mmCIF file of C-alpha atoms in Angstrom:
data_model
loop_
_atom_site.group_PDB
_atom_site.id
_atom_site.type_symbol
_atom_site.label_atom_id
_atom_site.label_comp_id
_atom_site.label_asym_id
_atom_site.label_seq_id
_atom_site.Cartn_x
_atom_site.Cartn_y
_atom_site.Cartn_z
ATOM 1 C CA UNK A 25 95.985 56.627 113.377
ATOM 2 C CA UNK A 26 99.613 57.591 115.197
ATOM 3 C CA UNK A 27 99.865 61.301 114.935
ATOM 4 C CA UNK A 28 102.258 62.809 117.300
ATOM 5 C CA UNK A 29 101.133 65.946 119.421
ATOM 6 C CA UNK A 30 103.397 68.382 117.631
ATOM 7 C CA UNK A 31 101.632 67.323 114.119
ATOM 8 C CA UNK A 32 98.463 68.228 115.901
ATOM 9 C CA UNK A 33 99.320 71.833 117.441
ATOM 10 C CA UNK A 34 100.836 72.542 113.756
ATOM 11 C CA UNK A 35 96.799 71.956 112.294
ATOM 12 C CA UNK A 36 95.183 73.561 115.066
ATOM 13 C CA UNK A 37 98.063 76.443 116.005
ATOM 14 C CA UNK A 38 100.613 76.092 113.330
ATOM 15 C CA UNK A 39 101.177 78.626 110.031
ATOM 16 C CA UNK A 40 103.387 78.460 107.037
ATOM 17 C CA UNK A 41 105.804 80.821 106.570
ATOM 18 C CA UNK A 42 106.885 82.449 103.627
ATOM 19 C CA UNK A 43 110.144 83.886 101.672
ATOM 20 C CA UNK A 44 109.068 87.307 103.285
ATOM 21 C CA UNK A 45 107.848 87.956 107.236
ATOM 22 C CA UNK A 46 104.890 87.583 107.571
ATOM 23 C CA UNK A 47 103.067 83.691 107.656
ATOM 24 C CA UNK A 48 99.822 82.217 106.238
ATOM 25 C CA UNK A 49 97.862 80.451 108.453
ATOM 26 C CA UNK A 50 95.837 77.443 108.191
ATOM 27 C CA UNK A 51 92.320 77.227 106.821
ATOM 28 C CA UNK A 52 94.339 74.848 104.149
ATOM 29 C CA UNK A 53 91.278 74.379 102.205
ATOM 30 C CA UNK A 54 91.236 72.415 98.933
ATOM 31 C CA UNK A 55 92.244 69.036 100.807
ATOM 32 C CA UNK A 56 93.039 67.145 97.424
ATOM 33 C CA UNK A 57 87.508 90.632 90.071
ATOM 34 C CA UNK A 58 88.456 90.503 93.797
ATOM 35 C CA UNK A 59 87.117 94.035 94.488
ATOM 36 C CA UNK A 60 89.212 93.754 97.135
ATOM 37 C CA UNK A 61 89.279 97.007 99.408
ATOM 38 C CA UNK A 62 91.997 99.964 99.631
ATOM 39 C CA UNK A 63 94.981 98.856 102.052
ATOM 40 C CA UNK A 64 94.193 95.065 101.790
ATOM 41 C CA UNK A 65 96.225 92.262 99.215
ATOM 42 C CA UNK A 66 95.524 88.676 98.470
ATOM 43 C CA UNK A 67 98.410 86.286 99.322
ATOM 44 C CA UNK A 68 99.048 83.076 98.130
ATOM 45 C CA UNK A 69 101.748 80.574 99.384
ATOM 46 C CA UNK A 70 102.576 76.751 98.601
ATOM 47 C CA UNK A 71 101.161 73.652 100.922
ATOM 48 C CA UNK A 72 101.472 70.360 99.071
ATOM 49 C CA UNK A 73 101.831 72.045 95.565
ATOM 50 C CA UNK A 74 98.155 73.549 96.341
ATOM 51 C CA UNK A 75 97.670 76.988 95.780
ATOM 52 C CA UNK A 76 96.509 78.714 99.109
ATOM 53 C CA UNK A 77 95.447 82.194 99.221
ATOM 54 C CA UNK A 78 94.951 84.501 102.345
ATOM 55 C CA UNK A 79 93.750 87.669 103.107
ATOM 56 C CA UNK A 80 96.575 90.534 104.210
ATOM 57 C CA UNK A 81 96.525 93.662 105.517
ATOM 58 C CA UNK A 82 99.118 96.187 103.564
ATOM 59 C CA UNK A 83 99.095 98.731 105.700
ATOM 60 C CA UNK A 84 96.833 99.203 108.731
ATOM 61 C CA UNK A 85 93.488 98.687 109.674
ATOM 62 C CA UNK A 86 91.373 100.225 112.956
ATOM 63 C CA UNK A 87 89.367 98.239 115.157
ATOM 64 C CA UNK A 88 86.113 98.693 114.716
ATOM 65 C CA UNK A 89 86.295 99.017 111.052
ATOM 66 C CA UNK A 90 83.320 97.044 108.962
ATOM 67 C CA UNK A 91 83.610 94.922 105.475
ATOM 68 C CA UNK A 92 81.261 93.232 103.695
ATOM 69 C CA UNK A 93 78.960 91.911 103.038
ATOM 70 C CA UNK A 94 79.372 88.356 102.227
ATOM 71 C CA UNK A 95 78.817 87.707 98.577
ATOM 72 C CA UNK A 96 77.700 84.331 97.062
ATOM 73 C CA UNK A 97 75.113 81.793 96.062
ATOM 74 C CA UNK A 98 72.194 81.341 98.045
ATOM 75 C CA UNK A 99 72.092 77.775 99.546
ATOM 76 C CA UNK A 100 68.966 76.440 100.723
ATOM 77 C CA UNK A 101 69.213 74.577 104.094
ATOM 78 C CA UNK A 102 68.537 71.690 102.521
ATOM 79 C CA UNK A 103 70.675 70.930 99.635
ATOM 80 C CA UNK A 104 73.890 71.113 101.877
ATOM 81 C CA UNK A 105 75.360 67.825 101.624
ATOM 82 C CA UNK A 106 76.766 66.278 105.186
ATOM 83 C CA UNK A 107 80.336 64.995 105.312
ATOM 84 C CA UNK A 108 81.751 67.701 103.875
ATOM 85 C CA UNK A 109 83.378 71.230 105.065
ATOM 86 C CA UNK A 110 81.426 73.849 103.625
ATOM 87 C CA UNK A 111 84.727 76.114 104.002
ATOM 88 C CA UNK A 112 83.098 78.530 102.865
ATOM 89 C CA UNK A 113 79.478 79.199 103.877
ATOM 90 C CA UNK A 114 77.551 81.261 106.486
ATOM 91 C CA UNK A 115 74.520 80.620 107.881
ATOM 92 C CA UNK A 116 71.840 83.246 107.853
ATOM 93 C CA UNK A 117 69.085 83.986 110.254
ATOM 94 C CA UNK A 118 65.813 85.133 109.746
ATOM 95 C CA UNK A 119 62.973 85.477 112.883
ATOM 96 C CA UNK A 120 65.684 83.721 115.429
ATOM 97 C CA UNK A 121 66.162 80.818 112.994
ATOM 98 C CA UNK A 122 67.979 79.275 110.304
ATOM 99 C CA UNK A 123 66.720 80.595 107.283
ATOM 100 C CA UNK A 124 69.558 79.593 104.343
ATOM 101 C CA UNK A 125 73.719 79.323 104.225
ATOM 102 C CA UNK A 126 75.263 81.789 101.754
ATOM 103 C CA UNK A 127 77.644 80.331 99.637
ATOM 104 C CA UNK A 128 81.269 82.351 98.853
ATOM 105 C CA UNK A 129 82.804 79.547 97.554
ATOM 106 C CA UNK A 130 83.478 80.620 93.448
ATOM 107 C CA UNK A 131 82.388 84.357 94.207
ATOM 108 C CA UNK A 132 85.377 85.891 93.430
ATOM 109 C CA UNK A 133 85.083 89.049 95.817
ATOM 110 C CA UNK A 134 87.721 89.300 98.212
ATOM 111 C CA UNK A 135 85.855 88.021 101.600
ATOM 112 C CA UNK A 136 85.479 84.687 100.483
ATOM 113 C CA UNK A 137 89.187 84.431 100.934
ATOM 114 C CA UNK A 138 89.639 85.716 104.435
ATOM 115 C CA UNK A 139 90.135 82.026 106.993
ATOM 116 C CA UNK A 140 89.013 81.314 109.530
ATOM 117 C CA UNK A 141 90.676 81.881 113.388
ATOM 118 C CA UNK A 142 90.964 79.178 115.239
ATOM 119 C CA UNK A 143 91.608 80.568 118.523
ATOM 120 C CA UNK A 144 91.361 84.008 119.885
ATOM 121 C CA UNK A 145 94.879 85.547 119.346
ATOM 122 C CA UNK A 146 94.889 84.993 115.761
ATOM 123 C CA UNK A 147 91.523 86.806 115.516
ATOM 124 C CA UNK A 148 91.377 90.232 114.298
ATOM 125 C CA UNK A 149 87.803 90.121 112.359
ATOM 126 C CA UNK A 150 84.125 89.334 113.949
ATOM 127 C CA UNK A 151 81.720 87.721 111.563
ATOM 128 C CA UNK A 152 78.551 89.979 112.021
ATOM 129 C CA UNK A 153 74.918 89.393 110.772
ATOM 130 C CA UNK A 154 73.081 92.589 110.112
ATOM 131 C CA UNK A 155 69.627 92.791 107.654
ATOM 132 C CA UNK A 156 70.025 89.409 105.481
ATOM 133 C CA UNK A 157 74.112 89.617 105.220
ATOM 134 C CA UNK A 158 77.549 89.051 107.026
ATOM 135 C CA UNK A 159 80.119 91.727 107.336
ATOM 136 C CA UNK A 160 83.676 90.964 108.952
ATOM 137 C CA UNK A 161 84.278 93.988 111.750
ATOM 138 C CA UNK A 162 87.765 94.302 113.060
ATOM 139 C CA UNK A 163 88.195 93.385 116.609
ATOM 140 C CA UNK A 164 91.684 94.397 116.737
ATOM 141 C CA UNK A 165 94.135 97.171 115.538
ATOM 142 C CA UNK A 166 95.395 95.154 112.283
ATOM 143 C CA UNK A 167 99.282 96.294 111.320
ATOM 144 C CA UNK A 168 100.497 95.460 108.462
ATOM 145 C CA UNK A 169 101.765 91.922 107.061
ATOM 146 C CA UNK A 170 99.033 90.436 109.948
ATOM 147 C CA UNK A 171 96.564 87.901 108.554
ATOM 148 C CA UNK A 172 92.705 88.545 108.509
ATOM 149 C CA UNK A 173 90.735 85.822 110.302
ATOM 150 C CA UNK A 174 87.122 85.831 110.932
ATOM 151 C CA UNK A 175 85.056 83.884 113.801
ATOM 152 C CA UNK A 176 81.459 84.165 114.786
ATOM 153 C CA UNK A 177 81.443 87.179 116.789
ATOM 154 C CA UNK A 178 79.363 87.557 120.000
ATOM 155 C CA UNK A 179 75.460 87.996 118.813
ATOM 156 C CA UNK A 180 76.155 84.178 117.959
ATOM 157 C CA UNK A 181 75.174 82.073 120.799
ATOM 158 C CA UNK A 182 78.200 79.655 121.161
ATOM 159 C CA UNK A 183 79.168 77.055 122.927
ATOM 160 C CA UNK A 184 82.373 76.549 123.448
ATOM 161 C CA UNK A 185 83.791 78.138 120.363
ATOM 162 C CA UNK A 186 80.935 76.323 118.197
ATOM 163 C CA UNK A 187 77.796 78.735 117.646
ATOM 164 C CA UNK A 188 74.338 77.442 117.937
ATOM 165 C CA UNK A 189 71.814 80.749 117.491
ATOM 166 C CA UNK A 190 71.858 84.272 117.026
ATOM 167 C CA UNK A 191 72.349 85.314 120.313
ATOM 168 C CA UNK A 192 68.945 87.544 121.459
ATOM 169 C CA UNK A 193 67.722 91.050 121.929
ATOM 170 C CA UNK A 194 63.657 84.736 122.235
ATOM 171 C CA UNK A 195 63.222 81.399 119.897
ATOM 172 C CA UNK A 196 64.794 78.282 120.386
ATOM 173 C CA UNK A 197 66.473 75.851 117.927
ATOM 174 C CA UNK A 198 70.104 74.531 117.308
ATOM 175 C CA UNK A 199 71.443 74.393 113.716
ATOM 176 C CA UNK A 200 71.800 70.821 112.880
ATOM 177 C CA UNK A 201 75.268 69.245 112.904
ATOM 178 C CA UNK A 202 75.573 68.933 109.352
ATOM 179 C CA UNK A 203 76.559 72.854 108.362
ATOM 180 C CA UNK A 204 78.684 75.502 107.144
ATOM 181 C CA UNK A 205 82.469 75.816 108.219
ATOM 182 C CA UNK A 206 82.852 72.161 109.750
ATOM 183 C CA UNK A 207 86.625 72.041 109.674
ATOM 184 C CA UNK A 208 87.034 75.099 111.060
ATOM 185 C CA UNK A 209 84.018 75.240 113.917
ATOM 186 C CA UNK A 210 85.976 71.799 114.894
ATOM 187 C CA UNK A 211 89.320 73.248 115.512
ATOM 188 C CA UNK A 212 87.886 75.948 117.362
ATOM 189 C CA UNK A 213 86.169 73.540 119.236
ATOM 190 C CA UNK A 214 89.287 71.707 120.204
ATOM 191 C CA UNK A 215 91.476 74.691 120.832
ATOM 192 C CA UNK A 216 89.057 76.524 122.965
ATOM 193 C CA UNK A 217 88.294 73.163 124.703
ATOM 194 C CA UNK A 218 92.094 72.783 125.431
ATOM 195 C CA UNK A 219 91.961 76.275 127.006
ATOM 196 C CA UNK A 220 89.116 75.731 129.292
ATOM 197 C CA UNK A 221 90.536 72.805 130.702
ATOM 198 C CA UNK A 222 93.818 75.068 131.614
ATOM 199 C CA UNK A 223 91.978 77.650 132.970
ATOM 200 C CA UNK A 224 90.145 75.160 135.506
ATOM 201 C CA UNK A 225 93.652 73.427 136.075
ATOM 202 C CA UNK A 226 97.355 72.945 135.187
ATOM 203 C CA UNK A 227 96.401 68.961 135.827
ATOM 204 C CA UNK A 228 92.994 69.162 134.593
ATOM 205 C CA UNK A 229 94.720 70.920 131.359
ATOM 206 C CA UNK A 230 97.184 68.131 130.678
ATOM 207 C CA UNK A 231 94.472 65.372 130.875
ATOM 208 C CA UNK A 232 92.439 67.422 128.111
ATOM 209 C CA UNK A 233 95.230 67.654 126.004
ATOM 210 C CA UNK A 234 96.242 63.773 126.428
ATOM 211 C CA UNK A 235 92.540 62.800 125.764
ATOM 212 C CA UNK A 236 91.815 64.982 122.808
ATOM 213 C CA UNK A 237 94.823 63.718 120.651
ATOM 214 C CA UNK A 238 93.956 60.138 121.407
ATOM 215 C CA UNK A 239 90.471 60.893 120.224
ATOM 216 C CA UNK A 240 91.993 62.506 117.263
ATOM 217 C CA UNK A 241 94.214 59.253 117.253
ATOM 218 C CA UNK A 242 90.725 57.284 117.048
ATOM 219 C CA UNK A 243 92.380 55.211 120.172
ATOM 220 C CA UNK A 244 89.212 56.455 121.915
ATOM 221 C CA UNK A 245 85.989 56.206 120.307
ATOM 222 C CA UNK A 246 83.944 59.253 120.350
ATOM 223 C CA UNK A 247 81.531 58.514 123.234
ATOM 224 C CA UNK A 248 84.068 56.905 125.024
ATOM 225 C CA UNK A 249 85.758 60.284 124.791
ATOM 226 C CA UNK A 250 82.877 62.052 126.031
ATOM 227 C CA UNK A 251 82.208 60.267 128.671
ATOM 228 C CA UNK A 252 85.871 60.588 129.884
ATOM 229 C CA UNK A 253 85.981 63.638 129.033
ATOM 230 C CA UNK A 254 83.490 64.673 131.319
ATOM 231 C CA UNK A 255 84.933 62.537 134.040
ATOM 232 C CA UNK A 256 88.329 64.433 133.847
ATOM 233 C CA UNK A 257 86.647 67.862 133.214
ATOM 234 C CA UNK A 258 83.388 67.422 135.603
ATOM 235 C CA UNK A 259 81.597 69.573 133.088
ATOM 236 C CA UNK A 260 78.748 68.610 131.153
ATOM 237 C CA UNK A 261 78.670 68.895 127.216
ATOM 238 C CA UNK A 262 76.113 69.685 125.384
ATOM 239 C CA UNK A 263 74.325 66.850 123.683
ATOM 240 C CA UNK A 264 75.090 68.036 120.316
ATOM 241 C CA UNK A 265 78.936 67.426 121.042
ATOM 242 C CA UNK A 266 78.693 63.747 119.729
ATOM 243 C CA UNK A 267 77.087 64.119 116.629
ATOM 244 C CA UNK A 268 79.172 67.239 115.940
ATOM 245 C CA UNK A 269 82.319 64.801 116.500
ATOM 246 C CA UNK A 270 81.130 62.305 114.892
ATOM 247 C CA UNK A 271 80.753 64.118 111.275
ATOM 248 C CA UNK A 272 83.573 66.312 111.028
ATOM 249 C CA UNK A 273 86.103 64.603 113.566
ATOM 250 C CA UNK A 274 87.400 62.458 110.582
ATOM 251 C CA UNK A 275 87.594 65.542 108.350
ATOM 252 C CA UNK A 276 90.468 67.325 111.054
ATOM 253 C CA UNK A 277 91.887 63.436 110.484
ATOM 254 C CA UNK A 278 91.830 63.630 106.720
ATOM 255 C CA UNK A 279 93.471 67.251 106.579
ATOM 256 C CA UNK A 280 96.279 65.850 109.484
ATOM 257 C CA UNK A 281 96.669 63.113 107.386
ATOM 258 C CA UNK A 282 97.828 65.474 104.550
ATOM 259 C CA UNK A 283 101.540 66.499 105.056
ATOM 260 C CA UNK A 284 104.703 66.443 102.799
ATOM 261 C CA UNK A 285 107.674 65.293 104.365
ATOM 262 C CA UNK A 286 110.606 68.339 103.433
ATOM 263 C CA UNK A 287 111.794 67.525 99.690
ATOM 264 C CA UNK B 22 91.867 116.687 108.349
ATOM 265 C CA UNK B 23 88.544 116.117 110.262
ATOM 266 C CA UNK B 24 86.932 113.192 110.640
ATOM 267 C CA UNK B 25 83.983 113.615 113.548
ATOM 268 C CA UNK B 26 80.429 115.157 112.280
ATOM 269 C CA UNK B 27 78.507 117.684 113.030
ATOM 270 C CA UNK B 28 75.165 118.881 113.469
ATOM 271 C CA UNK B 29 73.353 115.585 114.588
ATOM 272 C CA UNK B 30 69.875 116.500 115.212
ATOM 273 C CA UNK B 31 67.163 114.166 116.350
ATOM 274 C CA UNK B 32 63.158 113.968 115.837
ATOM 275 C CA UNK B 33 60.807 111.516 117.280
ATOM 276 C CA UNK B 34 58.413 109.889 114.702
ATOM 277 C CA UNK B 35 56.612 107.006 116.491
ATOM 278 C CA UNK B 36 56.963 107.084 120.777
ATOM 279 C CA UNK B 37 59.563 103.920 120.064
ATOM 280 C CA UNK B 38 61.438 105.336 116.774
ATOM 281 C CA UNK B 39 63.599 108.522 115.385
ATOM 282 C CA UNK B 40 64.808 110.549 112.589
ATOM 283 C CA UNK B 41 68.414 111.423 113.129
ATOM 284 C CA UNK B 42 70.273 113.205 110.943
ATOM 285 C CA UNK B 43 73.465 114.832 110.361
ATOM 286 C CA UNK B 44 75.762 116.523 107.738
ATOM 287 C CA UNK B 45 79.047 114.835 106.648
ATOM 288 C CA UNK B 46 82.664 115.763 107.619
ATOM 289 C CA UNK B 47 85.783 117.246 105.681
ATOM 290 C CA UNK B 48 86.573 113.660 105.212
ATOM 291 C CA UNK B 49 85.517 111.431 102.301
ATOM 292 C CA UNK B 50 83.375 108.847 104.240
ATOM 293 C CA UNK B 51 83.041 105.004 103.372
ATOM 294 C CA UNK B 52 80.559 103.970 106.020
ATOM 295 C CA UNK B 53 79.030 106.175 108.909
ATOM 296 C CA UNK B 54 78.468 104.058 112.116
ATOM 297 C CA UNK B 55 75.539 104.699 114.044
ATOM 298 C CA UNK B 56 74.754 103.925 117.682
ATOM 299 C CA UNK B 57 72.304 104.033 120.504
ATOM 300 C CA UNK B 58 71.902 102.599 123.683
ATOM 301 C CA UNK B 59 70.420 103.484 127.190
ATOM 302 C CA UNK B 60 71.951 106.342 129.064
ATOM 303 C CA UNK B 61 73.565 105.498 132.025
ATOM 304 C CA UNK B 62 71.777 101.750 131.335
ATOM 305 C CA UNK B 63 73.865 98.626 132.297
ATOM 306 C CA UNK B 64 72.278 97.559 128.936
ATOM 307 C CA UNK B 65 74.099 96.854 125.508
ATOM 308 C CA UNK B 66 74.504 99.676 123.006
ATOM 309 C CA UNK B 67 73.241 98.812 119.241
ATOM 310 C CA UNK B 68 74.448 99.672 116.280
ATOM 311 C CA UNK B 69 74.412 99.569 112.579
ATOM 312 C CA UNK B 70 75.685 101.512 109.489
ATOM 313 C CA UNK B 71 74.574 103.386 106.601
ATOM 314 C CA UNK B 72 76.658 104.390 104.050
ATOM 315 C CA UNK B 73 78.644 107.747 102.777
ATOM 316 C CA UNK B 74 75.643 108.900 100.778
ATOM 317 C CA UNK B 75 72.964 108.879 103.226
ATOM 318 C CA UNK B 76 73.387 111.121 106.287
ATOM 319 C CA UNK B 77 70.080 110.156 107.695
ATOM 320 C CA UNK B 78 68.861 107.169 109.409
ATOM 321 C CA UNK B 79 65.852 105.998 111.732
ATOM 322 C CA UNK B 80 66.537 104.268 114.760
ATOM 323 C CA UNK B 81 63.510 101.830 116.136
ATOM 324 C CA UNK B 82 62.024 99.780 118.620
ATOM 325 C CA UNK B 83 63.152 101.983 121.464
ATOM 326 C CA UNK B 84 61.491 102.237 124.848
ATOM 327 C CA UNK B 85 59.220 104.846 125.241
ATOM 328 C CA UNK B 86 60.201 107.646 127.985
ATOM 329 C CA UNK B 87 63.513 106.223 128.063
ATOM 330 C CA UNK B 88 66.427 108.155 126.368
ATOM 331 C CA UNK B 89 69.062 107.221 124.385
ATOM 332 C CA UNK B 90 72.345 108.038 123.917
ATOM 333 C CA UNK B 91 72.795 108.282 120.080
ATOM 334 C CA UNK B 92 76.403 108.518 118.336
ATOM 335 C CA UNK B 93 77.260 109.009 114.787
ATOM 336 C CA UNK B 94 80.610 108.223 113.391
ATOM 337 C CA UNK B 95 83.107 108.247 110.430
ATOM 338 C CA UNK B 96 84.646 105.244 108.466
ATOM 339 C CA UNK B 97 87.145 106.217 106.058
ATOM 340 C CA UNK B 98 90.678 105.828 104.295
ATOM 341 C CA UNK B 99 93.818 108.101 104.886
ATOM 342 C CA UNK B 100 96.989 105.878 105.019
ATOM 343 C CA UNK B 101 95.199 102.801 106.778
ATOM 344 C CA UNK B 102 91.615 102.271 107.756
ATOM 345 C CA UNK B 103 89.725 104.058 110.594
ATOM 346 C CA UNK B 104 86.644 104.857 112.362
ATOM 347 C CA UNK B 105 87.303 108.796 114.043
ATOM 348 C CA UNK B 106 85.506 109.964 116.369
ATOM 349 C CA UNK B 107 82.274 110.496 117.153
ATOM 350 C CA UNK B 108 79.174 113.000 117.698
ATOM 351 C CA UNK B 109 76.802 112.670 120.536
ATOM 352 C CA UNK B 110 73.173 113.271 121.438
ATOM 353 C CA UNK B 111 70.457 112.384 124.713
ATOM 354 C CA UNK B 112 66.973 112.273 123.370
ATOM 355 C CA UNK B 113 64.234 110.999 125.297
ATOM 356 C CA UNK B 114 61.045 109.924 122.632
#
């Protein structure tokens, strides 16, 4: 793979803009009723002649404000097939542990449309988990034409940007690489991996960003990106790093992969 | 034009759980947000919601002795979203 570094910030920073303002960004799902609340409106734009929908605010919303919750089929942990995205799935706890993923995908109320955020200034929404459901809780003050995007709010234990529990009020398991929201834990991964290396240092930054697009590239196998990775970084990753990569690394490839080129 | 209740009263039921209640505001109310946490405690405040039609809840698994500070407040619609402001109690169970 030869993907230049400005293909790669437009996947993991980039949005589309439309004949208005405001711009969708990219949860770009579909890689080859609505119920929707007062002061909200679904938008849909163009990317490769597939439809892509997104979740605006028309006029304002608070911070602090609560939606939900979730609405969708009730997956059991084991029927979830690996390989694949799960775009739109949460995972929900029972007793400090993974009990079943709730499916949104072909629900037809309005949350199952909000994306993802892939880094924290596109974030105005916290993905909450309170009785058996998920509400989305603003985080920000949301004006108008702004984008909603969701990310697992604090109460998830995360590492990194990728959540492992439900953070505690103790128990001890990881969800198993093979989950909900792949595509999307893996950009956050990446972006909030890029931004940990800057904080540490300007250098330290650069070599992050260098390495992660030539693992992205595939010029650098996975563990041989780990290992360097944690040469360059001299920080530990957790162990469930490499199987995390190794399952949904080529689905950020795949998606990268698909771009028209102008006409 | 109001938005903040009124008349939040609370009564211990169990030495580590209460009965709060309240009485709704001008305001037509979506959600009511209600919170409690350890006065003057370093510790995390809690809290979940109940909707417009209830203006009761019980708050549980509280330390015994200890008081709370509890906090009710308004979600609703006027022009945008918001959450206005809030009503305040201490009660020690």
């Amino acid at each position: 793979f030869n993907f230049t570094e400005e293909e790669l910030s437009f996947v993991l920073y980039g949005a589309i803009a439309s004949p208005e303002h405001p711009t969708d960004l990219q949860h770009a799902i579909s890689g080859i009723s609505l119920q929707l609340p007062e002061g909200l409106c679904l938008m849909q734009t163009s990317f490769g002649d597939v439809p892509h929908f997104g979740v605006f605010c028309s006029d304002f919303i608070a911070k602090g404000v609560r939606f939900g919750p979730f609405r969708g089929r009730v997956v059991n942990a084991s029927e979830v097939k690996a390989h694949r995205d799960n775009s739109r799935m949460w995972e929900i706890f029972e007793d400090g542990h993974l009990s079943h993923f709730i499916d949104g995908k072909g629900s037809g109320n309005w949350m199952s449309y909000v994306n993802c955020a892939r880094f924290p200034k596109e974030q105005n929404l916290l993905a909450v988990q309170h009785q058996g459901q998920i509400f989305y809780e603003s985080c920000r003050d949301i004006q108008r034409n702004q984008e909603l995007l969701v990310w697992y709010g604090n109460g998830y234990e995360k590492f990194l940007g990728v959540p492992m529990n439900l953070r505690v009020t103790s128990s001890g398991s990881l969800p198993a690489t093979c989950g909900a929201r792949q595509l999307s834990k893996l950009k956050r991964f990446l972006t909030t991996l890029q931004q940990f290396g800057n904080d540490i240092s300007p250098e330290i930054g650069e070599k992050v960003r260098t390495l992660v697009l030539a693992l992205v590239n595939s010029t650098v196998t996975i563990e041989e990106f780990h290992c360097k990775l944690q040469e360059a970084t001299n920080f530990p990753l957790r162990p469930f790093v490499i199987p995390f990569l190794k399952a949904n690394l080529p689905l950020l490839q795949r998606e990268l992969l698909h771009c028209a080129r102008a006409a | 034009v109001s938005s903040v209740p009124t008349k939040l009263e609370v009564v211990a039921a169990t030495p580590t759980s209460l009965l709060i209640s309240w009485d709704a505001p001008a305001v037509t109310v979506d959600l009511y947000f209600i919170t409690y946490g350890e006065t003057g405690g370093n510790s995390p405040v809690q809290k979940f919601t109940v909707p417009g039609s209830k203006s009761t809840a019980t708050i549980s698994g509280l330390k015994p002795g200890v008081d709370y500070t509890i906090t009710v407040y308004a979600q609703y619609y006027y022009r945008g979203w918001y959450v206005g402001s809030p009503i305040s109690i201490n009660y020690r169970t």
